[PDB]
């Protein structure tokens, strides 16, 4: 009876008031799923809990204390029980795509038995081999070309009606999505931040009135020269859903962006040009000038890196449904040949999402495929939960290589204390010299704040 965070609902109906069939979350329950509640709240949001308690937003460190709130965190009085556990990821070391797929489909405890049991619990017949009395044992794994086929061994003979018509578990359409947040690295092989030059000058206010209305801004461009290797071949097929910035390691700054819908392996490095954009709005006293300075740095860094790529695939259950016991919502009693594919990974549609179907199993309007409530009645909730937890356990492949980058950047434009004499600048810039240092099209300008 844990509190399931996805069944929480925030109501805005008055102090301690929930919607129909909801009851307020109490301070103990809230504390048990604090991070989940707080992550759904506004920075300084304060939300009600049962009996005069409130939970506060992340700005307040999600504290739980006595308080009055006209909005309330609520939970069903009759929740949907037995949520499918989200197990920790199943890691597959980096390797070629064949290596990765090979390890996954030959895995008895983590793949063959769980998917075999799924099909069995759904009503599919003969999900096992001839030399075993148990489901998902004596299973041959063969190739369908691009896809894999897991099916009970059929050599020799068997006892049962249509026993030679072994149900087939098919695995196809593998996808690999790199999770940027999974980043980690080894020893930072090389690191350092070097001052190559200091650009110094003056901003002068030759008027009888203090000047505060001029932006002083630096523009131009540098370049980050970088490279990244891929230890194995899976990287050829790995992509990221969204563009992201190469992570910051150390006390330097890089502006590298990894592009979405593009092969990890095709993104191996080069020269990414970066714009200089520092700006500041100084106040210069009347008839005085201020020292303005900009430090120009260069830095490099190298390390072995690693990311994880979430592995997804189509799981197609193919065989006939047992008479007097199957989960299809119309419960066919004519042992029809059946085909159904689940997408093991992110959601694509309702028909292929086990999680969606399971979570929505008490909404009759939604039961258009498998009747998960019937699987529970047959096997018990626990059995079904544990099985789906394994079927849906995240599979992740390690994506490794070496990273190396050489960068150039400016620090902030700094302003000094005023010395006696619109706003004007006196800051010498030598284009060629600057170019030699990796700083191009450099300019320093004054413009009104308007």
UniProtKB/Swiss-Prot annotation:
Q: What is the effect of changing residue 197 to A?
A: Impairs heptamerization
Q: Does the keyword Signal apply?
A: yes
Under Gene Ontology molecular function, one entry of this record is: toxin activity
Where in or outside the cell it occurs: the entry states: Secreted; Host cell membrane
Maturation propeptide residues: 422-450
Disulfide feature: 18-74, 158-163
GO cellular component, alphabetical, reads:
extracellular region; host cell plasma membrane; membrane
Database matches in InterPro entries? Aerolysin-like_C (IPR055267), Aerolysin/haemolysin_CS (IPR005831), Aerolysn (IPR005830), APT_dom (IPR005138), APT_N_sf (IPR037015), CTDL_fold (IPR016187)
Entry-linked SMART domains: Aerolysin
Give site residues, Important for heptamerization: 350, 366
State how it assembles: Homodimer in solution; homoheptamer in the host membrane. After binding to GPI-anchored proteins in target membranes and proteolytic removal of the C-terminal propeptide, the protein assembles into a heptameric pre-pore complex. A further conformation change leads to insertion into the host membrane.
Instruction: Return the protein name.
Output: Aerolysin
């Amino acid at each position: 009876e844990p509190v399931y965070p996805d069944q929480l609902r925030l109501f805005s109906l008055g102090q301690g008031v929930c919607g129909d069939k909801y009851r307020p979350v109490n301070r103990e329950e809230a504390q048990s799923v604090k991070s989940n509640i707080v992550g759904m709240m506004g920075q300084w949001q304060i939300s009600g809990l049962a009996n005069g308690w409130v939970i506060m937003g992340p700005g307040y460190n999600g504290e739980i204390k006595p308080g009055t709130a006209s909005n309330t965190w609520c939970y069903p009085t009759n929740p949907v029980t037995g949520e499918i556990p989200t197990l920790s990821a199943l890691d597959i070391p980096d390797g070629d795509e064949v290596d990765v797929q090979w390890r996954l489909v030959h895995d008895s405890a983590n793949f063959i038995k769980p998917t075999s049991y799924l099909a069995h619990y759904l009503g599919y017949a003969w999900v096992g081999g001839n030399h075993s009395q148990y489901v998902g044992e004596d299973m041959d794994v063969t190739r369908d070309g691009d896809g894999w086929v897991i099916r009970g061994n059929n050599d020799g003979g068997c006892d049962g009606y249509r026993c030679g018509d072994k149900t087939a578990i098919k695995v196809s359409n593998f996808a690999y999505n790199l999770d940027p947040d999974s980043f980690k690295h080894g020893d930072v092989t090389q690191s350092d931040r070097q001052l190559v030059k200091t650009v110094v000058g003056w901003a002068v206010n030759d008027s009888d009135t203090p000047q505060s209305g001029y932006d002083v801004t630096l523009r131009g461009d540098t370049a980050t020269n970088w490279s990244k290797t891929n230890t194995y071949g899976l990287s050829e097929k790995v992509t990221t859903k969204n563009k992201f910035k190469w992570p910051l390691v150390g006390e330097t700054e890089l502006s590298i962006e990894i592009a979405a819908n593009q092969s990890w392996a095709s993104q191996n490095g080069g020269s990414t040009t970066t714009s200089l954009s520092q700006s500041v709005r100084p106040t210069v006293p009347a008839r005085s000038k201020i020292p303005v300075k900009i430090e120009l740095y260069k830095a490099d860094i190298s390390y072995p890196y690693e990311f994880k790529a979430d592995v997804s695939y189509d799981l197609t259950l193919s065989g006939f449904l047992r008479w007097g016991g199957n989960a299809w919502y119309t419960h066919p009693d004519n042992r029809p040949n059946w085909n159904h594919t689940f997408v093991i990974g992110p959601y694509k549609d309702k028909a292929s999402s086990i999680r969606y179907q399971w979570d929505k199993r008490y909404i009759p309007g939604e039961v258009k495929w498998w009747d998960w409530n019937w699987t529970i009645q047959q096997n018990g909730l626990s059995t079904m939960q544990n099985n789906l937890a394994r079927v849906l356990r995240p599979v992740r492949a390690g994506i490794t290589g070496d990273f190396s980058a050489e960068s150039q950047f400016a620090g902030n434009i700094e302003i000094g204390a005023p010395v006696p004499l619109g706003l004007r600048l006196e800051i010498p810039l030598d284009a060629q010299e600057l170019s030699g240092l990796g700083f191009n099209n450099v300019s320093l300008s004054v413009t009104p704040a308007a």
